[PDB]
Subunit: 337 residues, 5 copies
C-alpha cells in the first residue's frame, strides 16, 4: 500500500523472485530480447604501441525488459542493492577484442540494478578494460590510428538476443572529456550489425575512435637532436684540413650519435618488420653525416698533392651540404603532411 512501507516492498520483491529461473532468458522460446546499451567513458588510461592495445575505463549500462520482474501498486522505480543482480538473469555481454578487464569492487562491486513497473531492468557496471588495437606504424609518428571496442553476446544468437545503441549516436558520452597527452580524438562512431558464425548469427555493437598522434613530443625528442647533429657535422667544413684529429673526431661522433638515436628509438617500439616514417628521416640524416666524414677523407687524400683543389671542396661543402639537407627536409615533410 504505502510506498514507504518496507514490509510491502519486501513482499513485492520476494514475489518477483519466487519461481524465477535465472537459467532462462526473458521471453525464452519466443521473440529475442532487445538489449539497449549506453557507455559513459570515464577515461582512456593509455595507448601502447608496444603491446598494440589501449586501456579504457567506462560506465557500461544495459537496458532490457523482463516481464517476470513486472510489479504493480508501487508507482516508483526500485533501485535495489547490487547483490540482487546475482539472483537475476543478465545478458552474457562480453568484449570481443579485450585482453584483460575487471569490474571495480571498492567499496562494493561497482554495479547497480534499477527495476521499473513494466519489468524493465537497468544494469550498470564500471569496467576497466584493456582492448587490443592493431596499429599501422608506417607513418609513425605522423600516423592516424583507429581503435575499436567490439561488443557481442557470448552464447545467445540473434534469435535470442538483439543489440542496439540506446539513444542512437548519443549512446556513448564523455569522449570530449578524454585527455590523451600523445593523441587527439578526431572522431568516434557507433556501428550496429549482425555477424555470422558457425553456430549462427550474433549481435554486434562496435565503438571506434580515430586517434591522431601529436608530433610535438617527437620534434623535441627525436627530430631536433637529429638536425643538430647534422648541423654539428657541418662544423668540420670550416675547420682547417691540417686538423686531422679534430675533423675525424667530428665525423666519428656524429656518425656514431646518429646510429645510437636510430637504434635507441626503435627499441622502444615493437619489432615491426617494415620501415617507419621516422626511420626514413633518421636514415637520411645518417647519409649526410656519413658523407661529411667521407668529404674530409677525400680532402685529406689530396690536400698535400693538390692543396688548391682540396680547399675548393671544403668551400663548396659549406654550401651544398646545408642546401641539400634543407631540400631533404622539404620533400620529406611535404610528403607526410
Amino acid at each position: 500500500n504505502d510506498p514507504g512501507n518496507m514490509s510491502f516492498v519486501k513482499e513485492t520483491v520476494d514475489k518477483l523472485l519466487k519461481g524465477y529461473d535465472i537459467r532462462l532468458r526473458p521471453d525464452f522460446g519466443g521473440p529475442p530480447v532487445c538489449v539497449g546499451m549506453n557507455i559513459d567513458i570515464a577515461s582512456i588510461d593509455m595507448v601502447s604501441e608496444v603491446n598494440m592495445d589501449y586501456t579504457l575505463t567506462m560506465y557500461f549500462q544495459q537496458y532490457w525488459r523482463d516481464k517476470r520482474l513486472a510489479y504493480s501498486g508501487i508507482p516508483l522505480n526500485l533501485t535495489l542493492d547490487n547483490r540482487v543482480a546475482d539472483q537475476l538473469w543478465v545478458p552474457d555481454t562480453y568484449f570481443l577484442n579485450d585482453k584483460k578487464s575487471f569490474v571495480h569492487g571498492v567499496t562494493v562491486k561497482n554495479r547497480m540494478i534499477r527495476l521499473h513497473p513494466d519489468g524493465t531492468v537497468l544494469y550498470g557496471l564500471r569496467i576497466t578494460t584493456t582492448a587490443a588495437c592493431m596499429m599501422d606504424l608506417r607513418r609513425y609518428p605522423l600516423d592516424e590510428q583507429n581503435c575499436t571496442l567490439e561488443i557481442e553476446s557470448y552464447g545467445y544468437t540473434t534469435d535470442d538476443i538483439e543489440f542496439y545503441w540506446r539513444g542512437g549516436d548519443k549512446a556513448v558520452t564523455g569522449v570530449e572529456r578524454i585527455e590523451l597527452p600523445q593523441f587527439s580524438i578526431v572522431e568516434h562512431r557507433l556501428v550496429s550489425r549482425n555477424v555470422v558464425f558457425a553456430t549462427g548469427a550474433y549481435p554486434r555493437l562496435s565503438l571506434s575512435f580515430r586517434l591522431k598522434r601529436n608530433i610535438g613530443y617527437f620534434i623535441l625528442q627525436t627530430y631536433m637532436p637529429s638536425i643538430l647533429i647534422t648541423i654539428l657535422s657541418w662544423v668540420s667544413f670550416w675547420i682547417n684540413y691540417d686538423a686531422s684529429a679534430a675533423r675525424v673526431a667530428l665525423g666519428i661522433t656524429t656518425v656514431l650519435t646518429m646510429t645510437t638515436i636510430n637504434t635507441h628509438l626503435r627499441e622502444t617500439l615493437p619489432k615491426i618488420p617494415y620501415v617507419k616514417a621516422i626511420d626514413m628521416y633518421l636514415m637520411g640524416c645518417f647519409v649526410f653525416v656519413f658523407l661529411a666524414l667521407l668529404e674530409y677523407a677525400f680532402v685529406n687524400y689530396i690536400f698535400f698533392s693538390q692543396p688548391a683543389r682540396a680547399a675548393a671542396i671544403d668551400r663548396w661543402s659549406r654550401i651544398v651540404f646545408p642546401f641539400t639537407f634543407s631540400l631533404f627536409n622539404l620533400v620529406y615533410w611535404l610528403y607526410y603532411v
Copy 2:
C-alpha cells in the same frame, strides 16, 4: 537482561536480522538516508608523473542510521565480527577517479561493524587506492599539483542517499603525518556537492591536496650537471688555438653531453607534447655550449690569416660567455620563482 549474558545478546542480534532485507536501503521509499564519512589517511605511497596517479592508503569510515537495527535493553554499543557486514545493507560508495583499489584482508578482512541502540551503524574499511591525477608539467620540476579523491554513490540518487563530511573540516585526519620525499602538502580541502547526471543528481564528496614539488633533488641531479658542463665548455677559451684536437674535443663532448642529459630526463617523464620548465633550461644550456664550439671554429678559420683578431675573440669569450650565462640564469630563475 545481563549485558554479559551472551545468550541474550545472541537472541537480540538474531531478532534484528530476522526479516531484514539487504536489498532495501534504510527508510526505503521515504527520506534519503544521510551517510557521514571520515577518512584517516594512513599514508600516500607514491606520486607518479608517468602514470598521472597517486597511491593512497586510508581508514574509510561511513556513518548512517538504520532503524531496522535498533535494539533495546542493552546499554552498550555492539562491536560485531566483520562478517556481519555481508548480512547488512551498506552504502554503494565508490571512488570516481580511482584506477585500482582493494581492501586489506590479513589476517581477516580489514573491516569493522559497530552498532548503536538507536540503529546507527559504524562501517570502517582500510583501503589502498590508486587514484588518477592529471598533472600540468609546464613548470616541472617547479610545478604545484592538485590531486583529488572523488567519492560518490554508484546507484542511488540524492533522493535516496545523501553525503556529508562528518565533523566538517576535521573529517579527514593524518594529512600532517604524510611523508612525501618529493612533495610537500601545502593544503587540503573538503568539498560537498551534488552532481547532476542523466539518471539524476548524485551525492559527491571531494578530498583534494595541493602538492608542491621539492626542487632539492633536481638541483643535484639535473641543474648542477648542466651548469658544470657549460662551465666545462668555457675551458676551451683558455686553451691555445693551435690545439685543434683539444678544443674540438671539448666542444664535441659538451654538446653531446648536453643532448644526452636533455633526452635521458625526458624519457622518464610521460611523452607530453609541450615544453617543460626544465626543458627550457636544458635547451638554453645547449645554445651556450654549441656557441662555444662555433666560437673556436670561427677562430680556427681566421687564426692563420688574422692571428691578432683571433686572439681577441678568445679573450673576449672568457668574459661574455660567463656573464651571459649568469644573465640567463637570473631571468630564468626569477620567472619560475
Copy 3:
C-alpha cells in the same frame, strides 16, 4: 507443451537436474565418453624468446553427450545461462604445457552452455593461455620455430574419456587471421593420440604451429649498423699515416662499437650457452674492424723506416678489406638461406 511457455521449460530443466550427480561422468562404469573439441583462435598476443613461451587467446569448445540431460517435448536446443555449468559434469580438460591461463569474466564469465534433446552438451570457454615453447636459437634470427598446445584429461584415463578433433583438420579456425609482426605462420597441424602414464593411458590432442621469423627488423636494427661500422673502419685506409690520432680513433671507436652491439643484443635474448647465427656475423665483423686497426699499427711501426712499403699496405688494404668482407657476407648468407 508450448515452447514459449517458460513454466514448462523450467519444469523440464528441473527434472533433468533432480538426482543429477556431478561427481559421476556420463556412462560411468561403461564405455568412455567421447569429447569433441574445436578451437577458434582469437589471436596470438606475443611470442617471447626470453621466457620461451607464447600467449594465446581462443574460443575453446567441448562436445559430448550426457544421456542424463536428454529431454523430450521441446523441439529446440536449450541455450542456458552460463551459471548452469557449475551444476553439470564437465570434462577435466587442461593444457599440459601452459604456464598461466584464465577465463575472461567481463561482463559475465565467458562461458556458454547449449543443450540438445538427445543429451548432447556444447560447452564453450574464452581462454587466454601462456604456453611454454622451447625455441632453438642456433639460427636466430633466421630460425623456424614449432610451438604446440597440448590438451589432456587430468584425472580420467582412456577407459573413461576419449578425445578427438571435431571436424578433422577443420577443428581449429582463425589461424589465417593471426597477425604476428615478427613471425609468419607457415603451417598448423592437429594430432590425436594416447599417452601412457603410470596410472594408465590418457587422451591427448596436440595443436602445433610452425613459425618463421621475419628478418626485416633485424636487417635494419643489427645487420646494417654492423656493416656501416665495418665500412666506417675502411675510411682509415684513405687517411694519411701521419694522422696517428685520427686513424687510431677510427680504429678504437669501430672496435668498441662492434663489442657494444654484440653485447647489447645478447642481453635481450636469454642466456643460452651456444652461439647464434647473428653472433657469428657480429664476431666476424669484429675481426675485420680489429684487423683494420692492426693494419695501421703495422703501418705506423714501419712508416718512418720504410715509407714506400707502408704506403703499399694502405693502398692494398683499400681493396682486400672491402673484397674479403663481401666474400664473408656471401658465404654467411648462402649458408643460412
Copy 4:
C-alpha cells in the same frame, strides 16, 4: 568414551558449534579477551630503499581462550582441519604499516586450528607481508635502519581485546636465521602498549629490527671506481704539456665519468631531496678531477711565455693532488665511521 572413537569426537565437536555465534567475541560484554601472539620468522625476502618497504614471511600464531569451545571427556588436544576456523570467532588482527600481504594457500590454506579442553584456541597463519619502512638515507650507504611491524586490532578496543607477547622476549624466533646479503640484524625488540584513537584505546604490539648495511658491495661498486678515476686524472701530470690532445682527453673523460657515476647511482635510489653520504664523496671526487683539468689549462695558458713556471706547476701537482685526496679520504671516512 574412547578417544579413538571418531563418532564420539564428532558429536563432541558438533555440540560445541551448536548455538555458537561467530559474531560475538568470547566473554562478550565482560572482561576483555587476552590474545597472546608469537612469531616464527621464516625469512626476510628483501629490503627496498626505492619503495621504502621490506618483505617478511613468518608463522603468525594467536593464543586465546574461548569458554564456549571447552570440552570434557577427551584428555587430548584437538587438532582440527583448517576449514573449521571459518566457523569460529577469531581476533581481527591486522598489520598497521603493511602495504600488501597474503596467506599462502598451497596445497591448502596455510592455517591451523588446535583446541584444548579448557577452551583455549591456537590459531596459526603463514603470512608473507610487505611492510612500509621509512629509511633515512643521509648516511647512505653507511646508514643504520629501524624497520618495525605494528600489530593492532581493527575493530575492538582495549575494553574488548588485549594483546601481549606470549613468552616475553622469546615470543619472536628465527631472527638469527635471517640471511640478508646487504644488511645485518643488530637487534630486535618487542613492545606492548595501548594507542589512543578517536573511538577509544586499542592494543598494539610492535616488532622492530635494527638493520646495519654492509659496505662491502659499495666499496667494490662505487667507491673504488671513483678512486681509480681520480688516480687516472693524475696521469696527466706526468704527460708533457705539448700533448694538448692527450691531457685534455684525460681531463674530459675523468670529468664525464665522474658525473655519470654520480648520476647513475642516484637514479637507483628514490628521488630524495637531501644529500647522501655517498653523494658527498662523489662530489668531492668531482672537484679533484675538475681541478686537474683546470691545472693543465693554466699550464697550457703560460707554457709558451713561462716554460719554467709551467713545469713547476706540473711537478708540484704530482705531490699536492695525491696528498690532498688522501687527506679528503681521511676526514671523510673518520666522520662516517
Copy 5:
C-alpha cells in the same frame, strides 16, 4: 549391483559422505595416518640469482587410506569429479621454502580424486611454485648450486600424520626431462626425516637438486670481451711514442671499457657483499690495461731526455705484458676448474 548402474554408484558414494566429518583426520585419536607422496616434475621454469629462487611446475600426488571411504560391491576404482575433494579430508601439506605458488585452474581446477575399495585416496594437484634458494656466488659463474623443496604438514605433528616417499628413490620423476639453458642437473636426492618444533615433531620430505652452471654463455659475453680489451691495450706498445694522443686514447678507452664491463655485470646480480670469481678476473684485467697506460706515461716522461731507454721499455712491454697476462689466465682458470 551392476557397475554400469549409475544409480547404485551414486547411492554408494552418498552413503560414504553421510556423517563424514572433514574436520577429523582418518583414524583420529589413533595411529597416525601415513601419506605417500610422488612428484612428476613438468619443468623448471627459471633460476633467478637476483631473487634467490627458482620456479617449479609439477604434478603433486598424495596417497593415504581413509577407512570411512571404503566401499564394497564395486570391483573398480572410482575416479570422481575434482569438486568432491572439497567434501573430503585432505592432508594440510605445504611447501616450507616456497615464496608464491598456485594450482592451475583451466579449464577446471587441475585436481583429481581417485577412490579405492579399501578406502585409499589418490589426490593429485598440478602446482607451479616459486621456492626460495640461497645461492653462494663466490665462484660465480663457475659455481654449483643446491636448491631444495621442503615438504611439511602445517598443523599435524608426527603423532597424527607421517610422510614417506612412495616408491623410494623413484618417487620423483621427470628430472631427466628438465631443460635449463644455464644449468645442468647433476643429481637429485630424496630425504625423509622428522623436524622438532616447539609444538612437537613434524614430518618432513626434502627434494633437492644439484645444479651446475654452464660457462659457455659467460665466455662469449664477459670473458672474451675482457680479453679483447686487454689485447687492445697492447696495440699501444707498437705505436710510436710521438703519438701522444693516439696512445693515451688507447689507454683511456681500455681503462674505461674495463670499468664499464665490471660495473654493468655486477648490477644484474644481487648486491652481495663479497667478491665473485668473475670479479677477480675483471679486476685482474683492469690492472693490466691500467699498467699499459702507465707504461706510456713513464715512456712519455723520459722519451725526450732518454730516447734509447724509452724505446727499450716499449720493446720489452710487447713481450712481458702478453706473457704475464697468459700466466694470469693460467693460474686463474686452474684454480676454479
